[PDB]
Amino acid sequence: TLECLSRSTLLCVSALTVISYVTPVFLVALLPLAVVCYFIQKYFRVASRDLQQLDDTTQLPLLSHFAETVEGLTTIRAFRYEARFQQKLLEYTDSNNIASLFLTAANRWLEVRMEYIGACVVLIAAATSISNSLHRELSAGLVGLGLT
Amino acid sequence: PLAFCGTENHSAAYRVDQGVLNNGCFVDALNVVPHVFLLFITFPILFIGHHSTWLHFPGHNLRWILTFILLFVLVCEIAEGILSDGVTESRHLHLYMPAGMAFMAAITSVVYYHNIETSNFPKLLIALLIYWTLAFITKTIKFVKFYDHAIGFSQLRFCLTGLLVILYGMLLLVEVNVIRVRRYIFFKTPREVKPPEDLQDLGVRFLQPFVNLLSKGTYWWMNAFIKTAHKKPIDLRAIGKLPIAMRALTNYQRLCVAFDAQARPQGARAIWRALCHAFGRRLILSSTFRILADLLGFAGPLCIFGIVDHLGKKTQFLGVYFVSSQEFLGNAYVLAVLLFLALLLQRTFLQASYYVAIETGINLRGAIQTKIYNKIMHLSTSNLSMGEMTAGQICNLVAIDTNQLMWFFFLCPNLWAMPVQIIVGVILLYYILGVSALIGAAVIILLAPVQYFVATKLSQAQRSTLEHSNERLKQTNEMLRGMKLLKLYAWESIFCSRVEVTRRKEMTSLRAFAVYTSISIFMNTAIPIAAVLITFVGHVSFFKESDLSPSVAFASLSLFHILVTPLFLLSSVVRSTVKALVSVQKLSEFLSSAEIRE
Amino acid sequence: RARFVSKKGNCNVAHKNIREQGRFLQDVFTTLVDLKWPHTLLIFTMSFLCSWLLFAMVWWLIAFAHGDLAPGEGTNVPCVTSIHSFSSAFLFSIEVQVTIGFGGRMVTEECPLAILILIVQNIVGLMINAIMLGCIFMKTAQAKRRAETLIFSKHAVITLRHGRLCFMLRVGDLRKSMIISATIHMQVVRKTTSPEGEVVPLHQVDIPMENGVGGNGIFLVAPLIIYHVIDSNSPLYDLAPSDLHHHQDLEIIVILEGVVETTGITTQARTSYLADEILWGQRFVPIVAEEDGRYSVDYSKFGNTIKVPTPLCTARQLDEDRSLL
Amino acid sequence: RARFVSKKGNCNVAHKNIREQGRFLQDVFTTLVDLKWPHTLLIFTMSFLCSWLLFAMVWWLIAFAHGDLAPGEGTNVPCVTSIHSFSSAFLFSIEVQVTIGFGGRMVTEECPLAILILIVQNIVGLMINAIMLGCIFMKTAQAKRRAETLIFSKHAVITLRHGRLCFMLRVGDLRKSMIISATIHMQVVRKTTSPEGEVVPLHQVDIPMENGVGGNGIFLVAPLIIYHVIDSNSPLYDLAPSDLHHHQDLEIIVILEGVVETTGITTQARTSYLADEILWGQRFVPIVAEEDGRYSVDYSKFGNTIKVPTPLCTARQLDEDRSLL
Ligand SMILES: Nc1ncnc2c1ncn2[C@@H]1O[C@H](COP(=O)(O)OP(=O)(O)O)[C@@H](O)[C@H]1O
Ligand SMILES: Nc1ncnc2c1ncn2[C@@H]1O[C@H](COP(=O)(O)OP(=O)(O)O)[C@@H](O)[C@H]1O
Ligand SMILES: CC1(NC2=NS(=O)(=O)c3sc(Cl)cc3N2)CC1
């Protein structure tokens, strides 16, 4: 995760610096997206912190339900309580699975918003660089740098 | 000033002495009529007009896909109309304003269809039917006139109005399929679909199987949850119940059907084939979404090629200039718009792929957990009483091994869709560069045996790491449970030293894994640099086929980066794969253990 | 704690799970009057503007098809005179539909399609004008905000009149216009449970208003103290001053249904009184006095109460104390 | 087996042998509003079109009689300017009657008959416009489809409340607009026979609704369980669970008569309950719950019933069992 984070967080700042060098006007459009991102990180982080915690607090009665089943297997099978404990497992598994599903869908919500912001970054940088190269000459090589 | 047909030759375009139907720029005036009819018949119905039990009409997925394609083709028609009228001094409103009116009409039509589908009003769909019929007529006349003046396929507007009439006919066929299935017109009216049983009374709040494709891909239904988490903490009441397709019992019965189909036992290979038979259809769906995302990811470098090539640098017909497909593709801004749309579609598909894979893994986890518990209720205590297995290992079959198999099922569609992306990327590299790209691909290929050697060493190191970590966790558990006896006998340091010895073996295996991981990362980060260097030196010093140019160089740079991005995570991929193989093997060992005889 | 009716008199009932089959869709006119004045004004301007624009596109298409938009050399009678662009057709559609008829642009008798579309636009414009006139008249003649001048006291009072321990109120009419056939319907809303086991969460039990010979009708000019005697049959028979706090589920709802004299449409003023808003041992201060000219109502004392010595027992205990004596 | 009222609430009574003396003919306006919207629209367009065509033939006959249709050499003032054919007279009749007045065609003051027929056409057009505006306003202000949002449960339930064996129902209001002065009128329809020998095929005996102090009025916001106590005076006193099948002739009809708050016109929702649609030993599930904001009504459970242990005897047998104890 540290290697992936270093590569991502340095390619992002390198790319923003490159687009700011070839098109300074992009900085004017860099401000609202950084606003919009912030609002998304305002709304997701409250929800996800719940949905992670609810995913953890539903994993504890599942795993412990295994731990008491293995050590008390003779007792459960002596009372003929196999079906009741399997039903308890079905309840615990359903709770943990739907907590994980809501965490997954919240993550997909956030990633859809961030990737659409990235597509907007591409569109804005392309518009600024193409308008420059048709108006104020960029030698047609810095445009490829900014788009790449 | 601001005339519908441009004031050329003293407004000669408005002269309709030659058969007004075959007079051009009047058929473009005829095209506005269905769109404004739909707007004026739809805006009061939508404006004048909660349903937790919503259903979906037949052809719902197809209608949303056809509407998206219709919006894309109308955007292309607006772009080519703006391109076409930019030469004449008078602005021709008939070239882009009917296409924009069509775009607004299609947006209003899909909003009307969504409100009808969430309100279950099929009898109003007749109105949409009339609009599509009118649109079809007003397109096909135009197409016929474009055939009668010999436009041909060399002009983009002819292909775009052919796509327009094809999509209008397809939407008309979807509408007549809807009236065939659900008879909302004067008929017997026999068919009632009814809401799905999970939505109507069970109390599920995970609406992802039940939302339309726009809210299925953008995850719009999550929005309210993201709002309500500000006002109230999310608990197990705000999260509903699992759907029937996502329930643990359903996936467990599906896995049991797969295992019974295999038997008509256990082992790792049979477990893998059972997981294939139970969940590979969803895995194929996620792989298809990832394949489409990979294909649309190449629209980036091609658009960079076209844009930078244009920045480095025709037929009059019926009194209005026409644009060829080559002129439309090579005029900078349009590519940017296309790139933006392609990027949006790609991201949506990619997120869909991820979601489907993760959903599949969660279902797999539930099934596996149920099967493990059903083995526990049929287990024998002699397995634990003779040291064949311990309760910590049985609990780690759920806490650790099922998680490893689940994360490998997360990572499966990327591995399935990687070779198609590699093949298309190498083909496009040859298309942009030439033989230099073949040399660079040969440089990439020449280190593949070294990559395979590093991957095998990583797999062996992670097998040793898992083997030592299980023993370390077993010794740590038996030390922690009997801590009072170890303190009373002053044997805490001895058992701590034994756990340190097992941890030292694990750290030796981890050091081997980290050394070969660093070798893999250096190889997969020096392969792109050496490949790019050898291509861009051989493209000028060795070969003289073409100039270097910024378009070719930066498009090939984007293609090289896109092709080498999956190679960055080789260590994590091989670690997850070998952890899955170990997990499936010990799951098969546990499921094929002794039982209690009846 | 939720209230069935607010103090202003709007219900807080939230409807859900209504499977809709178009019975909200058939009554376009009732929904059209139910909208707010900005929404009705928006629909009113949008329907007329969209009809003018639609027939404008029809007239402009006729002028395109006949050749009137092209510069004619001469001896060519257009379908409509003086139509040269889309704005000419739009001004002509406004002239036809609002029946202004400036006459620079007019229908010639050459094209039969122009005559037919003139007929169609006149019929459609008459339909739209009649529907909008009726909807606006129903919107103006609504008595919903006449009911806002029917004021109810903030507190309600349980005290003794003729040794009965009645629950009393105060209802006043601010305007001088009479409200004809004014009837008072008082109810008690609680979560009553039957002895068999049925639980009704909002069981409404009407209570009789002790005014006249068994009638709900009142004559409201001056403010009236409207009281219900807590006898044996009343649901408030077991009510005690140890009750009537905020946590208690008792609610008492008063409806004043009448006909406005000036508009002739029935209206109702709803009000609710929670348990903590019902005061035990008080009494409403008199507000009407004989002034020099005539009777005067002091509305500054309209809801004022004064503490009066009442028993702190329930009504059944007071009845049992009478039975012992 | 025929039903007096349908489940939707339309009567299935077929009238015949009505000797007609013109009392269906005098009330043109009531029949004109009774027609469907296509029929009212057809009469609305046909009356205006026929009036325009009739006065068009009058104007064209004037232009024929005065010599205006003939090509005049000059110095001849027509009765109406620019009338050259029948279509000119038709456009001029449209211009006069809808008061557009384009002014290419206009009445000159030469012919007094043209002035008189201008007066006659203006008076007739004002009459037609006023009658059609009033009929369209009455057509839009109808509360017939406001009553379609007043829902009644599919089944009705006979069970015990406070040991009484009452027959209960469920009435709900879908819209948030109030229905003022809502009254419930319940009846029992059977083929009752008198002891003297009189047979009434559809004898309607009203049953009292046990809600309030002897009143038919209800306050309908949330859905209400409307019950009638089967006491000694009720016609259902001898009803048994061995009855209430499809072959039984028992019918129970519920009328909800109220005034719509927004339109101010009285309406009624009729419903019928056959014997096989009345369930013995059930009970309506509660649907109103205190949500986080306010009260919420779950309309997905609106007609749901649950089986509750009730005696399988008639009401008179239960009363006799109480008399024995
Ligand atoms: N002067 C007044 N004008 C209008 N309404 C009044 C007036 N006085 C009291 N009310 C009504 O009585 C209620 C408040 O009663 P309360 O505050 O006890 O009376 P006061 O303000 O005289 O002490 C309000 O809901 C209001 O509708
Ligand atoms: N959600 C609802 N919306 C509108 N009307 C309803 C609803 N639920 C029940 N009704 C009314 O109740 C009757 C059907 O009752 P029933 O089918 O027993 O209720 P449910 O469908 O809840 O089981 C219908 O005639 C209908 O008018
Ligand atoms: C991050 C991006 N640029 C890039 N990627 S790279 O393939 O590592 C490589 S190698 C070499 Cl020499 C020059 C470059 N430039 C923009 C794709």
TrEMBL record, chain A:
**What transmembrane ranges does the database entry give?**
18-40
Q: Where in the cell is it found?
A: Cell membrane
**Reported function:** Regulator subunit of pancreatic ATP-sensitive potassium channel (KATP), playing a major role in the regulation of insulin release. In pancreatic cells, it forms KATP channels with KCNJ11; KCNJ11 forms the channel pore while ABCC8 is required for activation and regulation.
Q: How does it assemble?
A: Forms an heterooctamer with KCNJ11; four ABCC8/SUR1 molecules interact with one KCNJ11 homotetramer.
Query: Which protein family is named in the record?
Result: Belongs to the ABC transporter superfamily. ABCC family. Conjugate transporter (TC 3.A.1.208) subfamily.
What protein am I looking at? ATP-binding cassette sub-family C member 8
Q: Which residues of the full protein are shown?
A: 1139 to 1286 of 1582
